[PDB]
Amino acid sequence: CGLVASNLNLKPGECLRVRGEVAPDAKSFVLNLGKDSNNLCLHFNPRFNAHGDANTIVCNSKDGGAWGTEQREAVFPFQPGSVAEVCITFDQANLTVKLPDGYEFKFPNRLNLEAINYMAADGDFKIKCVAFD
Amino acid sequence: CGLVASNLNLKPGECLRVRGEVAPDAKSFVLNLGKDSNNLCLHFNPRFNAHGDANTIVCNSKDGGAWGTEQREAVFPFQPGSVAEVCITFDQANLTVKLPDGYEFKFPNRLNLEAINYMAADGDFKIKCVAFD
Numbered sequence: 001c002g003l004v005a006s007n008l009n010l011k012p013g014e015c016l017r018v019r020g021e022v023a024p025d026a027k028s029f030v031l032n033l034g035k036d037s038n039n040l041c042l043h044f045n046p047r048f049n050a051h052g053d054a055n056t057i058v059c060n061s062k063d064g065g066a067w068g069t070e071q072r073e074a075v076f077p078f079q080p081g082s083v084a085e086v087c088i089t090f091d092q093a094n095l096t097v098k099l100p101d102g103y104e105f106k107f108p109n110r111l112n113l114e115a116i117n118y119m120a121a122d123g124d125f126k127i128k129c130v131a132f133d
Numbered sequence: 134c135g136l137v138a139s140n141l142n143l144k145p146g147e148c149l150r151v152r153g154e155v156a157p158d159a160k161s162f163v164l165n166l167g168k169d170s171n172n173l174c175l176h177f178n179p180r181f182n183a184h185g186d187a188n189t190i191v192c193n194s195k196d197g198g199a200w201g202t203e204q205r206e207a208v209f210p211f212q213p214g215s216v217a218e219v220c221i222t223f224d225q226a227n228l229t230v231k232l233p234d235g236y237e238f239k240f241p242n243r244l245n246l247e248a249i250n251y252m253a254a255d256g257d258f259k260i261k262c263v264a265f266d
């Protein structure tokens with residue numbers, strides 16, 4: 001596994017900033033946000049070459065261990081062998097995922113947790129810094 | 134009870150940078166480093182006014198759940214209601230906690246672990262940024 005952070009206490013409107021290095025031969029990496037490994041209000045999974053997919057951003061939720069309905073973005077502003085920053089926040093309706101250069105995605109808040117207390121990173125993505133505004 | 138990070142995989146030489154907010158009513162705060170909650174190669178505990186200690190830094194280790202012998206430092210470069218920055222490293226001999234202005238606190242490496250996999254904040258210290266350099 002990669003980095004796992006708990007007790008984040010990330011309230012609505014507060015910002016979680018993660019920056020890491022994407023491997024030159026990356027196939028996929030994951031940012032899991034929620035309450036624990038079984039309860040994720042956001043499964044953020046850029047796939048470079050994984051699960052039959054290529055250069056596709058896959059998001060989903062996991063509620064009580066159960067995956068929800070997958071959603072995919074058309075754009076893919078991630079490059080293997082480069083540094084990537086992802087800023088996440090949320091309200092009662094949506095999680096908002098931003099990237100430093102104009103890119104912004106919305107994903108439905110399906111769990112409606114009080115806060116984001118759990119973050120797990122995995123795959124070809126070496127985290128360099130995490131910041132909690 | 135504060136931020137807890139695991140799977141850090143911080144090897145000797147690698148630098149852990151932490152920036153946080155010391156509470157205005159700060160009596161004490163803690164940075165725990167090691168393998169897990171029961172195996173800490175460094176218990177870094179600046180005490181403003183706690184457990185009978187005033188403006189004193191208390192370091193210790195925990196090995197298989199058992200606390201070691203406390204080491205105390207006279208120099209106290211911390212202020213309540215402020216921002217504190219520390220950089221942490223270790224080698225075979227010592228753990229080293231560095232502050233920006235030049236302060237350098239050393240604590241003997243008692244556990245001799247391959248890496249720092251675990252970090253936990255506690256007390257009057259709210260972590261705002263963690264970086265791996």
Ligand SMILES: CC(=O)N[C@H]1[C@H]([C@H](O)[C@H](O)CO)O[C@@](O[C@H]2[C@@H](O)[C@@H](CO)O[C@@H](O[C@H]3[C@H](O)[C@@H](O)[C@@H](O)O[C@@H]3CO)[C@@H]2O)(C(=O)O)C[C@@H]1O
Pocket residue numbers: 030043045051058059060067070
């Ligand atoms: C054990 C293991 O390696 N865990 C992997 C888990 C799975 O549980 C895996 O099936 C175990 O063998 O899968 C991981 O990624 C999944 C996740 O990204 C979800 C998001 O919705 O999608 C899953 O793939 C989907 C695919 O998106 C769909 O097109 C359709 O094919 O269904 C498949 C499979 O249901 C991913 O497998 C995970 O993070 O949980 C990767 C783990 O390493």
Ligand SMILES: CC(=O)N[C@H]1[C@H]([C@H](O)[C@H](O)CO)O[C@@](O[C@H]2[C@@H](O)[C@@H](CO)O[C@@H](O[C@H]3[C@H](O)[C@@H](O)[C@@H](O)O[C@@H]3CO)[C@@H]2O)(C(=O)O)C[C@@H]1O
Pocket residue numbers: 176178184185191192193200203255256
């Ligand atoms: C960990 C937890 O759940 N609560 C706090 C604990 C408890 O008070 C502790 O388990 C019961 O005393 O206290 C914590 O800090 C302890 C730690 O800093 C050790 C370091 O060796 O010192 C303890 O105080 C010592 C003191 O330094 C000595 O001079 C003498 O007075 O003995 C006391 C008690 O042993 C601290 O209590 C901890 O992490 O264990 C802070 C927790 O929030």
